[PDB]
Amino acid sequence: MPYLLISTQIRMEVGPTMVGDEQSDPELMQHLGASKRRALGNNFYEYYVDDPPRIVLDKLERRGFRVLSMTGVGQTLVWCLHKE
Amino acid sequence: MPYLLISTQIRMEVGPTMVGDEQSDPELMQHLGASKRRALGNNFYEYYVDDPPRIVLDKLERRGFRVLSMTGVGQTLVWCLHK
Amino acid sequence: MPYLLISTQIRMEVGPTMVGDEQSDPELMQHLGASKRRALGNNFYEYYVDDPPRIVLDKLERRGFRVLSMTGVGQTLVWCLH
Amino acid sequence: SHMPYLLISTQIRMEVGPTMVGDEQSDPELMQHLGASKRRALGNNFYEYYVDDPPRIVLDKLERRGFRVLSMTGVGQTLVWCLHK
Amino acid sequence: MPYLLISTQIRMEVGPTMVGDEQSDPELMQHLGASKRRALGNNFYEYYVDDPPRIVLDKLERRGFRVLSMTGVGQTLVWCLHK
Amino acid sequence: PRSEEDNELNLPNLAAAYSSILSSLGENPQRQGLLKTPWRAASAMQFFTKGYQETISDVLNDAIFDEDHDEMVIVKDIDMFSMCEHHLVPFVGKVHIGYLPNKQVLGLSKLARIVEIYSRRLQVQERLTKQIAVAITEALRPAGVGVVVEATHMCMNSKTVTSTMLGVFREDPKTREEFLTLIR
Amino acid sequence: PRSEEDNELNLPNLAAAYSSILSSLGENPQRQGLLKTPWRAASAMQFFTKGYQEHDEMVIVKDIDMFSMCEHHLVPFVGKVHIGYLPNKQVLGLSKLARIVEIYSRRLQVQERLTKQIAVAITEALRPAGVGVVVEATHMCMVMSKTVTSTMLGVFREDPKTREEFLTLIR
Amino acid sequence: PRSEEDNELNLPNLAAAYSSILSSLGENPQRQGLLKTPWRAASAMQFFTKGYQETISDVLNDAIFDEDHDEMVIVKDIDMFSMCEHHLVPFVGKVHIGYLPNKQVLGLSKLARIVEIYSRRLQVQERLTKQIAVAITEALRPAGVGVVVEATHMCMNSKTVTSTMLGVFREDPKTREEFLTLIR
Amino acid sequence: PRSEEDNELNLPNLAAAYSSILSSLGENPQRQGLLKTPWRAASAMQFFTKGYQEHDEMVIVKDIDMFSMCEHHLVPFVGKVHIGYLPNKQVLGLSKLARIVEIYSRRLQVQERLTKQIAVAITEALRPAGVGVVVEATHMCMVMSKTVTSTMLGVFREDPKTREEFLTLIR
Amino acid sequence: DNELNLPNLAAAYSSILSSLGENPQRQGLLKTPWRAASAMQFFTKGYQETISDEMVIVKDIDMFSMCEHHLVPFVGKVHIGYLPNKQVLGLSKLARIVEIYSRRLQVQERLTKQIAVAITEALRPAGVGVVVEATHMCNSKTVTSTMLGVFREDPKTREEFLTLIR
Amino acid sequence: PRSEEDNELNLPNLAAAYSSILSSLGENPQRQGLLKTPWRAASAMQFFTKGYQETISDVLNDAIFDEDHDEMVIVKDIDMFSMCEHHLVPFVGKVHIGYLPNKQVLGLSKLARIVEIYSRRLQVQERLTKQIAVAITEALRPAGVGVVVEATHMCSKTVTSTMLGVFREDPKTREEFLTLIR
Amino acid sequence: DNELNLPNLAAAYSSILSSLGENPQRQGLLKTPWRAASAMQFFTKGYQETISDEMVIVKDIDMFSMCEHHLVPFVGKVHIGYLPNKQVLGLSKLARIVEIYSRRLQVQERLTKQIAVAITEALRPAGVGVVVEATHMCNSKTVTSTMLGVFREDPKTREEFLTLIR
Amino acid sequence: LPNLAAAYSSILSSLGENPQRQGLLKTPWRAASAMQFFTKGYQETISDEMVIVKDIDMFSMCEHHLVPFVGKVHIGYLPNKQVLGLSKLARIVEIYSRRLQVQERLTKQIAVAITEALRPAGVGVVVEATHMCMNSKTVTSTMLGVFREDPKTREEFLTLIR
Amino acid sequence: LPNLAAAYSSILSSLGENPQRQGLLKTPWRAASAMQFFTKGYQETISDEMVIVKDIDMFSMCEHHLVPFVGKVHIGYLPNKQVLGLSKLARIVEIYSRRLQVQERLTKQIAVAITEALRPAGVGVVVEATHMCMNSKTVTSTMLGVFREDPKTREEFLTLIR
Ligand SMILES: N[C@@H](Cc1ccccc1)C(=O)O
Ligand SMILES: N[C@@H](Cc1ccccc1)C(=O)O
Ligand SMILES: N[C@@H](Cc1ccccc1)C(=O)O
Ligand SMILES: N[C@@H](Cc1ccccc1)C(=O)O
Ligand SMILES: N[C@@H](Cc1ccccc1)C(=O)O
Ligand SMILES: [Zn+2]
Ligand SMILES: [Zn+2]
Ligand SMILES: [Zn+2]
Ligand SMILES: [Zn+2]
Ligand SMILES: [Zn+2]
Ligand SMILES: [Zn+2]
Ligand SMILES: [Zn+2]
Ligand SMILES: [Zn+2]
Ligand SMILES: [Zn+2]
């Protein structure tokens, strides 16, 4: 997938970091060590890692992804990445 | 028509994703598989898709659009794209 | 006057879009079809258009402006152009 | 590249000042050029430099000094610009 | 470790500025003059400096970092830097 | 709409049905307390459903006024009496209405008439809540409308609360919060 | 007394009458929301009338929730019952007192009759020195204001000081 | 009694008078908010005085029920709306009624109708209080009746309370005390 | 503005109209209780419409009693006004604020207009950073339920945190 | 009398400002001698005025008075009750009675009796009851009660009155 | 500061002005109920203005305590009695105070003494609100202070609010304060 | 099961009466082993049962449960809220949900979650919120709160719910 | 106990009272026992979705004046797989309140004890009390973990404790 | 004062506390001054239609345990040509409450002081208080003269103090 969205809540220094959805590249999710789950009552599955977002950003750079934008929305900090 | 605004609410992983307004390019709206609607009490029509925003961003790249900015406002996550 | 700030509230798909303040270029405000007003109790005048912000962005590109940044603040969506 | 970053901000409405343009360690010459005044708002643990001008005027002035807007963000009721020379 | 996150709360003109987490480079943390602490009840340690964020940005430029993005979230102002 | 003629023509049929109910419950319809109950219950049921005799367009006659500038308009604690369509047992409570007009406002008594048309019918609380909100939205084309109904269902202390937010009451959380703060 | 068999046999007649009411009000009994209403209304009405199927201290049981049906209009009236008595040799168990209130309230009633029936039932069951019963209820016949009825028997009628103590203690 | 025909015939005269009042106050009867006020005020005044269209004997039709044994009967917090005859400004509040029947009782809704006939007139609180008490006494011949009216007079926090005690409510202080205790 | 002379001159016309109303309602204007009613009603109506004859803190004046007249039906509406403002260089004296509320409320009104007029009068008098006005009233047109109207100007409209502090402090 | 005595009252309030250690020339105190004098004249305007089958009660009548011992306000409510014979008291006349006596330098007991006596003299009723409850600025509440005629002689009349004023 | 000697020396002067007021209102100063009124009114006025006899530095003696960690400190419903300087008529109500210490706290009874020093003077509610907030800010150098005064003016309630430091800058701190003072 | 286990429950309650130092033969305690056993069976009848555009709230639902740690009742109220998609919950079905889970040996947290999960599974709504407030007999009140779906993800939905349950 | 009784006996003499009068005869021992009961917290040790326990009655003693302060404690926490039994929570409030205290310290000690015992995501503690040595109420508040970091968690807690 | 301070210093040592810690440094003197303030009534003397003064705030100290009891006093009297000034009534409540007391004694002493001062037809005194050494409220009532002899006077008083 050319674009990726990652996020963390409450504090930027600590995980979990959300790294994917049902249409994410399964190989990249496995490379990040992500687990799949559906939070109670939600209509979608998500991939997450225990790592803080800075670790995930460093890993995604080694996979050719670059941060295009970072934004805060509610108590969520989101990064939008794109392959080169 | 170089600029585009797209958005999603509450969670970034799931749609609907808003992709247009009344004056949007009808051909691009049809290409995205968007539907037109006016939410109850609103004074405007909007185009939306069921897809999560990341899918829409991938589709818009194939049409020559690049993300210039992404921002949060209330419970809405917005992307400003440009071709 | 190389910088410009535009904004909209509540929903991005519909205007009004704020496009200027008291020191804005009157010729650019007329080019955008803007009107001047002072909202009740405010200590400043503003220029606004009925168009949604995407239309204003397209018009400002034809005038040589480019979006440097976009942000949300409260219930306002702001663009900084140059 | 000496002191390359600058943060400016305004509250409530983008069209009107005051615009915050500095802190205690800001360049005194740049503060004087902008026509800024120094003050410590009651109860605050820091001094700040501010101007009456709306932020768009300050951005135009800072461009003439070699600064470019890198980012603009909203936080609470504050609109912030991060500039760099 | 190409990416860095820094932040400040409530006012941009005054510190503390958060500059690291448990996996941060301890040589860079020492270069910034940072101290390590765990705020009461938190499940993580953080590195912080008394300096306002503008001073930290200037210091990080002298170490080859550039600001990619700045955003507000809650009462926190965050910068994302890259080598 | 149901007419006064429809009421006179159907009153004996309603009375016959209520007399049949009295006999089927094991009661004596000839005892003093029940003698006129077929007709009293039939007339009461006609009163509880009198909203079928009214039309929203008839309520809207001389109902709209204009204003150069807008403000938040709220009418809270409007007593409401309705009939559950599932069990034919009343549900009673209050309606709180809020709207941010866009130059057109409803007369206060006409807003109350809007609650009356829809509540005086066989209803479900959710439909009643939406019908009031939609009627105001269609009549005034305001920036937004918020309607909250709270009621005790006699067929069931426990209260059902339904809430509809339209236009800016849905889109702008600050407008909705001001409304919810002011209805306390 | 009304039997469970009487209820099963009369349910369709109640449903037919409720269906006839829906048609006579100008409603459509075939619309989704009203399809099962004849049966739901019939069952509810049977439940509301299930009552036809059934020491030197002052003793009071106050704030007993009560649900009844006005016999004049067939609309509910709801409220509370406060009971007091001066026993001689017998005291009333709480569950038996609840059954007394339930038996009489779950009928087509007038609040005055309900008040007296509860007072007489306690007098007959316990043979006490006296009994007082106060019922307070909101009548849906009115709202679409509280009615208070009071019966004093034995020493509750003869000795005003006993009645005053009772009325003070039920606040 | 005032008829529906009397109302239709007198409505234009009431509207002419209210239009004259608008002009005499220095107001513009042609401005939007006042355009239909002559007719709305005339119709509201007819509604506030609709008790002149009713008769106590008509209210008493099917109103009486019998009982073998008596009890104290009270209906408290009956909302009351009336019009001061001295200033033509509403006075609003509550009516508390008590009676000790002597074998005849009024239906609850008929008691409320009795408050309605007398309150929906140009009144003085003292007359209203007595008319309700006298109507119940005459209709039922009970052992006694007590009526308490409490109202805020808009032409004036401050409340007027009037109290009439008849029969055993006057003669037996214990009956009156039980009534006053139970209306709290 | 309406003068004291205008009042004296128009009093008989108001009295004649009130006398005509008494006759048109089916009442006897010659009965003792109604003899002086044309004059008493006329004087009361003139009094109700006498309005036609006329820093880094948040400052609030709450629970200001308000009496007005609905212009649609000519029936009173009564309640309270809560006022808030963020002054710049001028603060409003309590008696002047009362006069503002009185001037606009003592007229034939709609609650929305009354709310705006008070907010605009404070804005013009003080030139503050912002003003908020909330009116809550019981409408006799309804009772024979509370209407709440709210106007936010300047920073009270632009800054939701200022408006929230105001709404919290008026409880 | 008011116009003639206003400068003397203002001179006395100016003197008070100096004797407390305050500066009468400071901005906030410049008009105080005249404003305090006008307020005191208004609080004592009652000296400018003169008196000219059911239980009837008017309760929760707001009352504002000035204590004569310390010159500090006492504020509260008046509850009045009477059993008329041939005359009934109009609401505005009752308000004037409370105003005339309360707008003077008073003691709560005297005020309570003056209102009761004025109603007795005006109506010649069977009896009158007056209860005043007030906070004296000079949480604690003073309650004074006067019962005349049948309100004193018949405890049942007084009890009905006290029950109905709740 | 006003001394106890100043009070003894000026009490006869206050009594002479209150007697003159009694005569100027049309009252008889020689009637039984008014004989001691010049002295009682003079003593009451001195008591209502006793705040001029004290200084904030005297109140701050032994007033400060230290803590390693902070949290929100609120003292609500502090009864307040003051005199309006425009008309010389009391204004009475309550003071609610909140602060986020930065390692120094005030003893509870010392916080009450601060309200007393400023309220027991000829005042305007706005000045009183600010003086309390400024006194706490200056004494403790806390992260922020919030002061809300609500009062009835005897000459309907006036509510004044001052937010300083983080109580002004951080809306979440101010919101917690306003929620907790209900 | 109830009839078969009733004598065993009664034998255990009889044993409890002796172990407390009481006399099981005294008049007032003679039927207690059977009455206490029947009451305990009724308090745990929930084990005999099985699950089979607007904001919708049902507040102040009376709740009676038994704490599993001490076998002492905990009583209070349940407030439920949801944002339906295609299905809405009938009032009697909601009452049955609260009854099934509350009439068991419980912990307040488990009860709160079981009600929220049962509504989520029955309706498939956008989200559900459940708040339970109870006094544990074993003035102090325990309040537990579960937010699922949009009630967890969207703070504005949760805030509207919490405001409307007052 | 005898030293406390001797001190209370000495106080009764230093006030101008008659320690031999009936009402004061056993007061040195009763006052000593009451003071020991008010300070029994020094004898105890901590080793021996949203969850809230509100309106917990609290009794403590002001360390500055030795006069009681009484009120309520409201506690909230977001657990991480461990929950606190109601009697253990009462023991926590008791351990710290039954000492010579300042309301701020007591508030923090309860919050820290719950954080250490359960290792939750966060804890919030609000104490409200009337101080007899001063009507007015002192309210102190401590927010730890996510109760400090996430304003939405803190707001839900403050709403639910009403 | 120094003897009271020495006794409070001794109590701080007999509890297991550190009298040298910041919060306790000046406590022997502050506690001594508070106890002197609570017992200042021993320094004062009484020589130096229906009328009621209700909701008079009252603060006293239990003589059995030396723990405060706080509440309100409601007073009523029927004068005989002499009336009690409000500040003198407050001084009466103060003289007796500011002592080591039992609520019954304090109630009687206030009633007797008013009877002796005014020689009225009768006096009624009701005290309601919360006792910290124990929520529950203790109510004591004394009726003298016509307040005891005439039940109608007592009933009017009890009705008017609500
Ligand atoms: N619901 C998220 C905000 C969010 C909105 C839109 C997309 C992503 C996240 C929060 O409250 O933190
Ligand atoms: N009303 C949006 C925020 C928003 C404002 C302006 C434009 C776009 C979106 C929300 O509350 O989520
Ligand atoms: N007051 C704006 C936010 C804003 C702040 C600063 C600059 C511009 C806008 C709002 O609430 O939507
Ligand atoms: N305190 C600012 C937000 C902000 C936080 C951090 C840095 C700068 C500003 C406000 O509420 O408007
Ligand atoms: N909790 C932060 C916001 C935040 C969210 C996500 C990551 C970082 C910060 C605040 O309220 O200030
Ligand atoms: Zn139903
Ligand atoms: Zn009926
Ligand atoms: Zn009148
Ligand atoms: Zn109207
Ligand atoms: Zn005095
Ligand atoms: Zn003043
Ligand atoms: Zn347990
Ligand atoms: Zn202390
Ligand atoms: Zn004791």
Q: What is the dihedral of CA C18, C20, C22, C23, to 10 degrees?
A: 160
Q: What is the dihedral of CA E30, E35, E38, E43, to 10 degrees?
A: -20
User: Among residues F52, F29, F4, which one has the least CA distance to residue G22?
Assistant: F52
H-state helical runs in chain N: 2-13, 27-38, 86-97, 103-118, 146-149, 151-160
Contact K145, K133 (CB under 8 A): yes
Residue-wise burial string across C24-42, b where 16 or more C-beta atoms lie within 10 A, e elsewhere: beeebbeebebeeeeebbb
Whole-angstrom Cα distance, residue A14 to residue G141?
63
Mutate to test the interface with L, among F156, F166, F171, F179 (most CBs of L within 10 A): F156
Angle at L6 between CA L1 and CA L9, to 5 degrees: 120
Residue L102 structural domain: 53-166
**J162 in contact with N at a CB cutoff of 8 Å?**
yes
Shared-domain flag, residues L38 and L73: no
Whole-angstrom Cα distance, residue F36 to residue I35?
45
Q: What is the 3-state secondary structure (H, E, C) of chain L?
A: CHHHHHHHHHHHHHHHHHHCCCCCCCHHHCCHHHHHHHHHHHHCHHHHCCCCCCEEEEEEEEEEEEECCCCCEEEEEEEEEEECCCCCCCHHHHHHHHHHHHCCEECHHHHHHHHHHHHHHHHCCCEEEEEEEEEECCCCEEEEEEEEEHHHHCHHHHHHHHHHCC
H-state helical runs in E11-81: 26-31, 53-61
Domain count, chain H: 2
**Helix or strand (DSSP H, E) at D32:** helix D28-34
Query: Which ligand minimizes its atom distance to the CA of D82?
Result: 4
Whether ligand 1 lies within 6 angstroms of the CB of A73 is answered as yes
Whole-angstrom Cα distance, residue L164 to residue M37?
44
Residues, Cβ < 5 Å to ion ligand 11: K 84, 86-87, 155
Residues in I touching K153 (Cβ below 8 Å):
94
Report the SS3 class of residue E53. helix
Q: Is there a catalytic annotation at residue J133?
A: no
Residue with tokens 């709230």: L57
Nearest CA in chain A to E2: A58
Angle at J24 between CA J23 and CA J28, to 5 degrees: 95
CB contact under 8 Å between I72 and H40, yes or no, is: yes
The DSSP letter of residue F85 is T
Considering the candidates N62, N74, N101, N109, report the single residue annotated as catalytic.
Answer: N62
Contact J110, J74 (CB under 8 A): no
Angle at H173 between CA H168 and CA H178, to 5 degrees: 90
Residues in N touching M109 (Cβ below 8 Å):
none
Contacts (Cβ under 8 Å, ≥6 apart) of E67: D5, D70, D71, D82, D84, E57, E79, E80, E81
What are the Cα distances from residue N47, in Å, to F22, N44, N73, N125? 82, 9, 21, 20
Shared-domain flag, residues H64 and H91: yes
Shared-domain flag, residues K136 and K175: yes
Contact F25, G57 (CB under 8 A): no
Nearest CA in chain K to E39: K69
Whole-angstrom Cα distance, residue J158 to residue J155?
5
Shared-domain flag, residues G50 and G61: no
- Single-letter amino acid, residue M21: R
Shared-domain flag, residues F41 and F85: no
Angle of helix F125-140 versus helix F108-119 axis, rounded to 10: 140
CB contact under 8 Å between F75 and I110, yes or no, is: no
Q: Could you tell me where the beta strands, DSSP code E, fall in chain K?
A: 64-66, 72-84, 90-100, 104-106, 122-123, 144-153, 157-165
* N-to-C CA span, chain K: 37
Is the backbone of residue K88 left (phi > 0), alpha (psi -120 to 50) or beta? left
Q: What is the dihedral of CA G109, G112, G114, G119, to 10 degrees?
A: -170
- Single-letter amino acid, residue K64: I
Question: Cβ–Cβ contacts within 10 Å for residue H165, how many?
Answer: 25
Report the SS3 class of residue A8. strand
User: Among residues B44, B57, B59, which one has the least CA distance to residue B8?
Assistant: B57
**C39 in contact with F at a CB cutoff of 8 Å?**
no
Shared-domain flag, residues K100 and K45: no
Q: Chains meeting H at 3+ CB pairs closer than 8 A?
A: F, G, I, J
Whole-angstrom Cα distance, residue J31 to residue J25?
9
Q: How far apart are the CA of J95 and the nearest CA of chain H, in angstroms?
A: 9
What phi, psi does F141 have (nearest 5°)? 45, 55
Report the SS3 class of residue A56. helix
Whole-angstrom Cα distance, residue N42 to residue N63?
14
User: How far is CA E16 from its chain centroid?
Assistant: 9
User: How far is CA H129 from its chain centroid?
Assistant: 8
Shared-domain flag, residues M100 and M21: no
Report the SS3 class of residue C70. strand
Whether ligand 2 lies within 6 angstroms of the CB of C18 is answered as no
Structure tokens at H42: 């005339």
D62 CA → ligand 3 middle, Å: 23
Whole-angstrom Cα distance, residue N15 to residue M4?
8
- What residue owns the CA closest to ligand 1's atom 11? A74
User: For a pocket test of ligand 5, which of M147, M150, M153 has the largest count of ligand atoms closer than 8 A to its C-beta?
Assistant: M150
**H36 in contact with F at a CB cutoff of 8 Å?**
yes
Question: Cβ–Cβ contacts within 10 Å for residue J47, how many?
Answer: 15
Whole-angstrom Cα distance, residue N77 to residue N83?
9
After which residues does chain A become discontinuous at a C–N distance over 2.5 Å? none
User: How far is CA N7 from its chain centroid?
Assistant: 25
The DSSP letter of residue J134 is E
User: How far is CA I50 from its chain centroid?
Assistant: 11
Structure tokens at F8: 């006179």
Whole-angstrom Cα distance, residue M25 to residue M2?
15
- Single-letter amino acid, residue F181: T
Whole-angstrom Cα distance, residue D84 to residue D59?
11
Structure tokens at N2: 């120094």
Whole-angstrom Cα distance, residue J166 to residue N162?
9
In the structure, how many helices (H) and strands (E) does chain G have? 7, 5
Whole-angstrom Cα distance, residue I152 to residue G43?
54
Shared-domain flag, residues L133 and L80: yes
Residue with tokens 């954080």: M115
Contact M35, M89 (CB under 8 A): no
Shared-domain flag, residues J153 and J81: yes
Whole-angstrom Cα distance, residue M7 to residue M9?
5
Residue-wise burial string across D14-25, b where 16 or more C-beta atoms lie within 10 A, e elsewhere: bbbbbbbbbbee
Whole-angstrom Cα distance, residue B76 to residue B68?
17
Nearest CA in chain K to J75: K154
Shared-domain flag, residues M30 and M62: no
Contacts (Cβ under 8 Å, ≥6 apart) of D57: C23, D19
Q: What is the dihedral of CA N43, N45, N51, N56, to 10 degrees?
A: 10
Considering the candidates F8, F67, F86, F171, report the single residue annotated as catalytic.
Answer: F86
- For chain M, the DSSP string reads -HHHHHHHHHHHHTTT--TTSGGGTTHHHHHHHHHHHHTGGGG--S---EEEEEEEEEEEEETTT--EEEEEEEEEEE-SS----HHHHHHHHHHHHSSEE-HHHHHHHHHHHHHHHH--SEEEEEEEEEETT---EEEEEEEEEHHHH-HHHHHHHHHHT-
Q: Residue N126 pairs with which residues in a beta bridge? A: N74, N141
Residue-wise burial string across F44-67, b where 16 or more C-beta atoms lie within 10 A, e elsewhere: bbbebbebbbbebeebbeebebeb
Report the SS3 class of residue G65. strand
Q: Residue E20 pairs with which residues in a beta bridge? A: E47
- For I85-153, the DSSP string reads EE-SS----HHHHHHHHHHHHSSEE-HHHHHHHHHHHHHHHH--SEEEEEEEEEEHHHH--EEEEEEEE
Q: What is the dihedral of CA A65, A71, A74, A78, to 10 degrees?
A: 0
Shared-domain flag, residues K37 and K54: yes
CB contact under 8 Å between C44 and D15, yes or no, is: yes
Residue with tokens 């004996």: F12
* CB-count burial class (<10 Å; 0-12, 13-18, 19+) for M29: middle
Whole-angstrom Cα distance, residue J131 to residue N162?
13
User: How far is CA I83 from its chain centroid?
Assistant: 13
Whole-angstrom Cα distance, residue L133 to residue L131?
7
Whole-angstrom Cα distance, residue I107 to residue I71?
8
User: Among residues I165, H141, N40, which one has the least CA distance to residue M16?
Assistant: N40
Residue with tokens 């109630």: N107
Q: Is there a catalytic annotation at residue K5?
A: no
Whole-angstrom Cα distance, residue J114 to residue J46?
13
Contact I139, I103 (CB under 8 A): no
Q: Is there a catalytic annotation at residue K69?
A: no
User: For a pocket test of ligand 3, which of D10, D12, D15, D19 has the largest count of ligand atoms closer than 8 A to its C-beta?
Assistant: D12
Whole-angstrom Cα distance, residue D18 to residue D51?
6
M106 CA → ligand 13 middle, Å: 14
Structure tokens at H155: 């032409």
Angle at K53 between CA K52 and CA K55, to 5 degrees: 85
Q: Is there a catalytic annotation at residue M36?
A: no
Structure tokens at H73: 């009967």
- What residue owns the CA closest to ligand 2's atom 1? C10
Length of chain A: 84
Give the dihedral sign, CA D12/D13/D18/D19.
positive
Contacts (Cβ under 8 Å, ≥6 apart) of F45: F14, G21, G25
Q: Residue I84 pairs with which residues in a beta bridge? A: I60, I132
Shared-domain flag, residues F86 and F108: yes
Angle at J142 between CA J136 and CA J143, to 5 degrees: 145
Contacts (Cβ under 8 Å, ≥6 apart) of J81: J55, J56, J57, J58, J128, J129, J130, J151, J161, J164, J165
Structure tokens at M154: 């803190």
Report the SS3 class of residue F81. strand
Question: Across chain A, which distance is largest between two alpha carbons, in Å?
Answer: 36
